[PDB]
Design a protein around this ligand. Structure first.
Ligand SMILES: [Cl-]
Ligand SMILES: [Cl-]
Ligand SMILES: [Cl-]
Ligand code: NA
Ligand SMILES: [Ru+3]
Length: 129
């Protein structure tokens, strides 16, 4: 599923991501935009052989199991495919664990490089939330 910008904002809020660990909703929407262009099916192989999955491109190196990332962990206790569902619950639940890991949203390199410090509120501007 390819979410619209305000549609994703609303689903993220419903699932408790707005202001989670202090990150406003615009930050999450901006992270999703650059990580997956709002497409729940997005996948990208990393150089190290791990793979990022879903709206927030969660990495199999640590967070989900894909059966093909040697030596990795599955800290969200989920098959990576769950992260590609039209329903974003699994991605959100696992994102909450990632963002609580110590480095906040810097765990998402696109958020640090393209969202951090910017006017992220623009991402939820005009949305009926
Ligand atoms: Cl594996
Ligand atoms: Cl959803
Ligand atoms: Cl933080
Ligand atoms: Na893994
Ligand atoms: Ru839902």
């Amino acid at each position: 599923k390819v979410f619209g910008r305000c549609e994703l904002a609303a689903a993220m809020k419903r699932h408790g991501l707005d202001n989670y660990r202090g990150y406003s909703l615009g930050n999450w929407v901006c992270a999703a935009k650059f990580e997956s262009n709002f497409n729940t099916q997005a996948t990208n192989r990393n150089t190290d052989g791990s793979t990022d999955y879903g709206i927030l491109q969660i990495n199999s190196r640590w967070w989900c199991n894909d059966g093909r990332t040697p030596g990795s962990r599955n800290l969200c206790n989920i098959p990576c495919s769950a992260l590609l569902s039209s329903d974003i619950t699994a991605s959100v639940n696992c994102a909450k664990k990632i963002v609580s890991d110590g480095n906040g949203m810097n765990a998402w390199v696109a958020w640090r490089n393209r969202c951090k410090g910017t006017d992220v509120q623009a991402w939820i501007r005009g949305c009926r939330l």
